[PDB]
């Protein structure tokens, strides 16, 4: 019911009991205080309006799915669609003050992969990892999500721009459903706790949701402020990040970017729609070059559009670089 918080947890690996079992980085700060893990979300008049963008360094996200400070964003994918690689890029190329990762329901080797990744990370000195392996009970797995949230909430009250990752909301939902055997709706209460405080910092949250052969993922689609969809089709095609920008949305998009940006984004999204229409025409074998000038114009832009959407996972792009690239693509 209470947990460790503080700068002394930066670089530490926290188990579902709130104890430090490993370290991926050592910090000079030893600040350790204790806060309740269950805490009420901020009432609406303490919450600020999401106005400032949360830059991620990922081109398609920063251009067409621009995240905001205090926003809650879902990552819908079917493992393995590169959900872990996408969150690695989100931690690498964003500019948050502090990163809090919560690995819920991972089987056991998976957690060691991320701790090894944090050991060689640029952001190692600003990360806190909370984990709950598949061997822990369901009670411990739900406490993992709330320990991670409470750790992020303390940094937000200190004024820090925090980024919280919950992987995954689905295995967290299984654990809550399993706990329900003891004689369902703690999920929304958690998913409200992020946000930007008028009197403090912010928590920008990323929740992963595992898809494939969910009925209630449509309601968690209804509670968040946008969702990023990783298409198994595009991953097999060889395009990473395999984000389907046409099936993704950031509901705060028009509030966090200027009009210059809105016009460029709208033009790119229709260019993508025309590209997909031409893909259906090509697969039908009814496309012959020189027959239709508009189809030839769109065809010759397929390559530059694919080049803009792709991104080396070791590379990050500033906002100016992103808008410059998408501008040349629309020309």
């Amino acid at each position: 019911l209470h947990t460790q918080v503080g700068r002394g947890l930066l670089g530490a690996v926290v188990n579902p009991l709130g104890e430090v079992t490993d370290k991926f980085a050592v910090t000079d700060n030893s600040e350790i205080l204790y806060r309740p893990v269950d805490n009420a979300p901020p009432l609406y008049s303490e919450r600020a309006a999401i106005e400032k963008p949360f830059l991620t360094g990922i081109k398609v996200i920063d251009s067409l799915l621009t995240c905001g400070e205090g926003q809650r964003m879902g990552i819908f994918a079917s493992a393995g669609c590169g959900k872990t690689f996408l969150m690695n890029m989100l931690i690498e190329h964003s500019g948050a003050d502090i990163y809090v990762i919560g690995l819920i329901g991972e089987r056991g080797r998976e957690v060691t992969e991320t701790v090894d990744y944090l050991k060689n990370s640029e952001k190692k000195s600003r990360c806190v990892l909370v984990y709950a392996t598949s061997d822990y009970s369901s009670v411990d797995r739900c406490n993992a999500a709330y320990i991670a949230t409470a750790i992020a909430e303390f940094f937000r009250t200190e004024g820090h721009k925090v980024a919280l990752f919950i992987d995954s909301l689905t295995r967290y939902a299984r654990a809550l459903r399993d706990v329900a055997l003891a004689a369902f709706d703690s999920l929304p209460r958690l998913l409200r706790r992020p946000g930007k405080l008028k009197a403090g910092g912010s928590i920008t949250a990323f929740y992963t949701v595992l898809l494939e052969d969910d009925p209630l993922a449509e309601e968690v689609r209804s509670i968040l402020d946008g969702h990023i969809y990783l298409s198994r089709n595009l991953a097999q095609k060889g395009q990473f990040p395999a984000i389907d920008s046409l099936k993704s949305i950031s509901r705060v998009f028009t509030q966090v970017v200027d009009e210059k940006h809105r016009i460029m984004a709208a033009a790119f999204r229709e260019l993508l729609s025309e590209i997909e229409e031409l893909r259906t025409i090509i697969d039908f074998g009814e496309y012959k070059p020189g027959e239709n000038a508009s189809q030839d114009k769109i065809y010759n832009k397929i390559s530059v559009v694919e080049s803009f959407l792709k991104q080396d996972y070791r590379l990050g792009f500033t906002y100016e670089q992103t808008m410059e690239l998408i501008g040349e693509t629309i020309r």
Side-chain angles (χ1 to χ4, degrees), residues 22-73:
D22 208 359
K23 286 185 247 251
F24 49 89
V26 297
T27 62
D28 45 309
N29 216 309
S30 64
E31 175 198 48
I32 288 276
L33 311 108
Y34 303 91
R35 295 285 185 271
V37 152
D38 192 349
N39 195 23
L43 58 67
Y44 81 103
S45 70
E46 316 173 330
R47 224 187 327 280
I50 299 179
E51 175 188 8
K52 189 164 180 23
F54 182 93
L55 292 183
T56 72
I58 304 170
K59 287 171 291 167
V60 50
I61 297 179
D62 285 353
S63 61
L64 303 155
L65 310 166
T66 326
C67 301
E69 270 208 43
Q71 182 184 10
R72 289 123 44 228
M73 179 79 69

Side-chain angles (χ1 to χ4, degrees), residues 43-278:
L43 58 67
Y44 81 103
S45 70
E46 316 173 330
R47 224 187 327 280
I50 299 179
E51 175 188 8
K52 189 164 180 23
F54 182 93
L55 292 183
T56 72
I58 304 170
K59 287 171 291 167
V60 50
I61 297 179
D62 285 353
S63 61
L64 303 155
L65 310 166
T66 326
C67 301
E69 270 208 43
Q71 182 184 10
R72 289 123 44 228
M73 179 79 69
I75 300 179
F76 292 72
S78 83
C81 273
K83 59 144 200 280
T84 292
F85 262 38
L86 176 65
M87 271 169 306
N88 284 8
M89 286 187 70
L90 276 167
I91 290 182
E92 285 307 83
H93 312 291
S94 51
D97 293 322
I98 278 155
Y99 301 87
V100 180
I101 312 105
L103 309 179
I104 317 168
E106 309 292 78
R107 80 132 300 285
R109 37 144 178 73
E110 291 167 8
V111 56
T112 306
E113 320 195 41
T114 59
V115 191
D116 289 354
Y117 164 90
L118 294 165
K119 273 170 179 173
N120 297 94
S121 174
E122 32 164 346
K123 318 295 187 64
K124 60 190 302 183
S125 42
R126 337 171 79 151
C127 285
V128 184
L129 188 125
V130 188
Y131 76 95
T133 204
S134 52
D135 320 312
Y136 284 91
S137 72
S138 306
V139 170
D140 282 335
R141 286 190 261 195
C142 303
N143 288 284
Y146 293 108
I147 281 164
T149 301
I151 288 177
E153 274 184 316
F154 171 79
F155 290 129
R156 184 190 51 200
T157 49
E158 291 294 283
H160 296 150
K161 167 175 160 170
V162 193
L164 168 78
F165 298 78
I166 291 302
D167 185 316
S168 61
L169 258 200
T170 43
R171 253 142 182 96
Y172 162 80
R174 309 165 173 263
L176 196 65
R177 155 179 57 171
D178 289 333
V179 163
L181 208 81
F184 298 110
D185 209 86
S186 92
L187 164 73
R189 316 207 190 261
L190 197 180
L191 299 209
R192 307 315 163 56
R193 283 160 83 161
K196 151 73 176 177
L197 294 192
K198 290 177 177 176
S202 67
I203 290 181
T204 310
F206 295 85
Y207 305 93
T208 67
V209 168
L210 286 188
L211 271 168
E212 192 36 34
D213 57 327
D214 188 58
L216 300 105
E218 304 157 277
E219 158 66 10
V220 80
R221 207 153 81 237
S222 203
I223 196 192
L224 302 180
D225 312 302
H227 51 263
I228 296 170
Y229 169 61
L230 301 186
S231 185
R232 84 141 200 175
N233 214 10
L234 301 197
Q236 294 170 352
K237 185 154 161 288
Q239 164 195 121
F240 178 80
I243 299 165
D244 194 331
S245 41
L246 287 182
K247 310 310 193 330
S248 314
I249 194 191
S250 169
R251 316 203 169 175
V252 298
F253 174 75
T254 64
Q255 313 157 27
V256 306
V257 303
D258 58 320
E259 270 296 330
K260 276 268 164 173
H261 190 147
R262 226 155 317 167
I263 314 189
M264 278 185 278
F268 189 86
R269 288 202 199 84
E270 200 145 69
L271 184 44
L272 246 181
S273 303
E274 282 170 346
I275 280 170
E276 280 290 299
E277 294 183 6
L278 190 58

Side-chain angles (χ1 to χ4, degrees), residues 291-331:
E291 164 198 56
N292 194 291
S294 318
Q295 312 207 144
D296 302 338
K297 190 131 50 205
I298 281 141
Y299 179 91
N300 282 327
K301 288 195 133 138
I302 293 174
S303 68
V304 281
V305 164
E306 297 192 345
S307 299
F308 171 79
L309 300 179
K310 69 84 210 160
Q311 188 162 336
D312 195 318
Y313 78 95
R314 270 130 47 235
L315 279 188
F317 293 80
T318 71
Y319 178 83
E320 274 263 337
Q321 293 170 329
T322 296
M323 302 319 291
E324 181 189 24
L325 282 173
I326 201 174
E328 260 299 315
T329 302
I330 293 312
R331 299 323 168 195

